[PDB]
């Protein structure tokens, strides 16, 4: 039977959520593709269900987000912040609820889901000032009696792609800053957050039919791969912002370059962690556990390769252990839990897949490796060391909290042994000496777009499209 | 027999040019590749014969190159910048004898090719200036005793793919940019243009060996489409910079995006002028004439098709068809002539194909259309009018001077046509209405990247890469 | 006796007023100062009194202002942003009770009062999201391993005199950028808007006092001219902001001068309306008559001068004439009056004056000039013709409604005429030239520091210290 | 018998100089005002004469120069940008001759009035491309329709007074931005570098003339304190910049904020350098050196206070003795030599009363502190321990070069008594401790504006006025 239809959910009615709900948005609710359940990690149950857009309800959609961009293009971008600002008050009065609801069915413990939330509202707080500073220079013209201006233009409809693991931030963010730019949005999440996407959008609808604003401004289109694909060869939407694996990225990347689309791709990425022989072990080992084995290492930013000088090897791993112990495990919702389930069955798998390999592959499990005995997909965080660098294993990003620990000698080979690395999302290194710093961070350092040193504003110009305009007046 | 091989083209060798010269530089000269020989366009005789790449020197070079970026981008940004003041000096001092190899192996008149020189001699000194600007905010960490900074580092290797259009300028602007910001560069030119990019790069590896640098921060590697092809493929290529059709544009992007390297287009666009009711004729005839015509309609910004209002057109028809009849064609080193020949014979194929088919689409030349009777590559300035807005060879970008002229009645017509077309590069309005052209520069106007009104400094960011480093010294 | 003592005027209580209030606060309230007591300038009736700052309290709460500082310069900006946020939400929850007492204590009428402090609000809205954009580059060096780093700080202790006519929302502004800049702050109000002040103060002060930070990081000294002069000679106010009269800021800029302060000035300036001859007259009418009329004309852009081309002279001021008729005014409660009364007994002598010195310089009135004959401090809103450009009595500005018209053939003649005044802040130009429109706004045009056609975000560097730091860590 | 009527000068008439020069430039050459004799500081043997302004000629300049803005403020600033580079390769073409004078007038040694030109020069490059920068955003209005515009504009006439010790640079600064910020500019130097300011400006007016520009965009008015004050007090004047003593700036100051003008003060500083217990003393010595003697201690930078911790504070006295006495002293301007005179018999006379004085205050002389036996104005560099951090003398910021050296225990002391001083142009600290660092770089730390670890671009904006636009198109 469906949680939602439980007494002990009924919570969940406080998010508009019924036993089967609208999976479309454009003004009016509807779906008439799948029905798709979606399921709670930490019990396997079901929640409640949702009715996808069918490829006819895609097409309407964006024929209504485009018509209703006529009106919202025209309205001056402070009071298109004014609409997010009012998002941002709607969102803080459902805090509470609607973490629960990301604790729920996206897996991740309470202050996390909460915190998503919160990371959202503070994003519509930032877009109402930074409305204000929208804008391109007027230069000066070589030419006398000439304008030259920079002008800066909505690109039109802005498809936003999503993926489970955090179902509400990204959206957050690709919508507030699209929205004061003037443009349109259409949101596919990830299938297994839909109920995340239903309920955040019922808290947008409100307010933009409050506004007397045209619906589709925000619109939803919840469904599959058909629907995803389709963004990624529509003419019509302007610009595709996709947030997902790399592969699948690629793809959403080729097919919007065959026909001169934009995108924004956030793909993935290997996290490392490198501690050189003078780090503080106390900044180190907590820094490390929190990084390996938060939101059940399902972060994009989660540490799945760990450097340690030799000097320190072992007694970092032996600390890592004594830490990874007292992890306290049980439904994320709880507000006592420190550790929920992986998002699905699958992962479970990938998961036993992994370690099975890494050991094939030579590695030694010194923590962890095994599905634990409960309902719902729970695995032990896992430390595996003994492998090489070079290990393919190590180089999939696997979901899963397994983390691959590299001993090294000096800066020079740990250094190499990083830059052989592609995918490279953040770096973070602890150590004190300040010449190496300043090496890892300039030209010869990491190539990661993020990096740490002793620790785990024209955004909205990709938002827009510049044209260089000359005025002759005389 | 070559033309430099002749006593009047002995001004030639004041550019280090030989009867063969060496078509790949990376610190020392070679080319074990095929043997091309450029044509001079107003005689169609042989001007000198240049070696081209092959791939073991194309190999050679990449290496050397990113061995060169060791050195180079370790030399202080305002320093670097002094390199390339010293490289526009060398152009300065060469301006007269660079700028009549460009009239003679491209076939732009004189004070264009002089003119061409002069705008790298402006962005040499640009980028000084520039080089002494470039850098990120230390922003406020939400987090005591945390600093948030952001950092901006070279590419790498940046690979630039130009055209014959423009054979010295656009590397140029490429080139100076791509130095101050501490990145190496590789240089494949059109082949036909092969003679003027050796003569650059001559210029350049001067400066560059006076100084003690390595020549390979500034490659050259002469070639076709298989250089063009390797550059694309190439991972150690980090950025590539291309220039030229749509068609092969769009294989390059697809090529730099299956590797996730960077990449940056800059692809054909057809450019219209649009002459309203109210607009100033003593303004539209003159600017239409000289966009049309300018550099033989050989320019990425060439006006090829000209939207009239119904109630002028006949009248602007006719002062253009007088008018044109005064346009006097000729040698380049004329200083009476507005234009000289095309690029190639196979350009002049090309112009009397698309002439043809005009008139198969019902279109009437009612002035020019014929190849002139005279050495060289030498064709009328072409008017044809008739055609229909959508007709197909009128969105054929045929670099000659061919101008399409079609009748309008209503604003929101000519619009709808204008933004029918989707590889539009420049629009330009002659009105006196200020609603118009609010309209036509706002977010429900022209889709062009540039914009013109009654006519015809972050840039450093597109070759480096950002990153966010978090630094705790708490 | 006292409104505050009556029982319709029990809202007030809601601000945390009382019969007798305490005007100094620095983390605690009190003030052993003079009494001052304020009144409704609608029914000239007491509202209630406050105790103002003595010397003693003066020197007390600068110097608990510079020890808050030591706590408040550490809290990072992004934290002293959500401070400001939660003023902006304190304010909000106020913003009925607020704005009825702007209207109740200065006169203006509810929609204003209520409308300034949602300035406020919108101003911390605003500033939550500047306090993530603070800082500078780090610039590249001219010499290898050296850091040039672009440093901003605070200044300090900002000192801020406000004036009667805008009460909350000028202190607002500037409290809410200094704070976030990590300034501490000391208001000393407009003695006759002292409850104002007050009440804001117990807004703020809760905020700060609810999140265990000390309160004299907005500190309040109530008091009059000594107190002003106090400031402005303190060396410890690092930086005085002033808005007020030019007189008394020549004044107050001296002597921060002679001490190498700072200071900020906003000082009064005339404001003129020019209509040329092609202008819409359906604008000009009601855009003069708003902007001559609005807060009964004690803006600091309150339109005090009107130029109108000879050919439509006559028009303008019978259509002025009709509308003027119209103008509803009374009490600042009634939601059907355009303007209520000027704030103190003294400006009604003011106005008087003011109406007999023009008519002794040959004015005509030909509208108002009457004072109402009805409690509070009421007047009719008046038009004076005839006057020479250059007739004293319109160089002055009198804070009541009288605008003075005067007639212009030239161009020429009427920017001449306007551009030989000097302390001009606005100007508001009338005409469908864009030729025109250009030149008004160009390097030749009006000199103030707004101009407007056809209608009558690094502000944060003001409040913060620049250096340059340079870090050898070769 | 002047030095230029001497054939061992008579490299000075490539400067255009003769034994009597005008000192008045507006287009015309002139001067009826009093006839100055320099004298060159090395021998004290009198140079040549000027013949500087009368009031009449200030008065007739200034109205040439404010005639000739009309022309300026009209070319467009990539053109005026333009102007300033051909500055600069004039400059480039007389830098020994022009340094050499430096050399022989101011009584700088060669290297360094070389690199003065050089300064300058450097600027020029740098004002090109900053030419192309100039301008203000579009931001967004709140109302629909509505155009919300950030311009700028030149100030008109901007006026700049420069010192003796940087005749040339200073005024290079403030004559380009200036002049691609479209002001026309009106020079009176130091009287004692009258034939340095008459042979800049021989070179800038050729410049001019050569462009068919009026000469007077860069006026030159030489002469006293009439003339100084004259611009202080002068309405014209739109921004005076000043370059000298803090009690002369004080008094421009007040001036120019009497009659509302705008102003530029750089005045002193105490320049102060502080090693703590960790320096590295093999920086730390040969940087006080430098910092203490360079320019014979007449820098704006010159170090006067050295603070050493107790424990190194003895050897490194001893090591700067052994290093000055290491210095090489002769006629500045043979390349052979590392230090030069005083720039006049009065400093000398300065020099002597600091140095007894400090004695008469208890200080000890530990090296130097007599005048030289030679002719001109030489005295020794002198080091001088054993004064309180308080000591009145210590704090006189007396242009020549004493250093007064103090010891301190820890860093809270030494913090405190540097945050004690005034005028603090900049501050220097040699450690290793990062921390420490940090703190002295933050908001409690150090007050100067330039801060320096272990070492010794909307500039444009200062020289323009901003308005706010509005313009309604609806």
Redesign the interface.
Known sequence: TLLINQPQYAWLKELGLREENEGVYNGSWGGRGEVITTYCPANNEPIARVRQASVADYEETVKKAREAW?IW???????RGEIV?QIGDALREKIQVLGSLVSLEMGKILVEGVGEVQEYVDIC????????????????????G?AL?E?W??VGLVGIITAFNFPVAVYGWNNAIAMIC?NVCLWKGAPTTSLISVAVTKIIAKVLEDNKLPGAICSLTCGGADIGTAMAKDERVNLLSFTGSTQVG?QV??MV??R?GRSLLELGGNNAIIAFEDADLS?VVPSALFAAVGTAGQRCTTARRLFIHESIHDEVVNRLKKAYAQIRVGNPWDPNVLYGPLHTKQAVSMFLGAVEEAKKEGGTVVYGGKVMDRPGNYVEPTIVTGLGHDASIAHTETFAPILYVFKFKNEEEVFAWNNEV?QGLSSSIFTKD??R??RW????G??????????P??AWKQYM?????????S
Chains 1, 2, 3, 4 share one sequence.
Request: proline share 8%.
């Open positions: 006529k293009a025209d309205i001056p971008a402070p009071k600002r707080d930032y877009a109402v000032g930074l409305s204000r500073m929208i804008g391109g220079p007027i230069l000066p013209s070589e030419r006398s000439h201006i002008q233009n909505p003037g690629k990347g080729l370059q065959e001169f900044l592609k300040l010449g710093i300043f961070l300039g030209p010869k990491s190539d990661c777009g993020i990096v740490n040193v002793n620790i504003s024209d499209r510049r044209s260089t305009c000359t005025i002759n007046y």
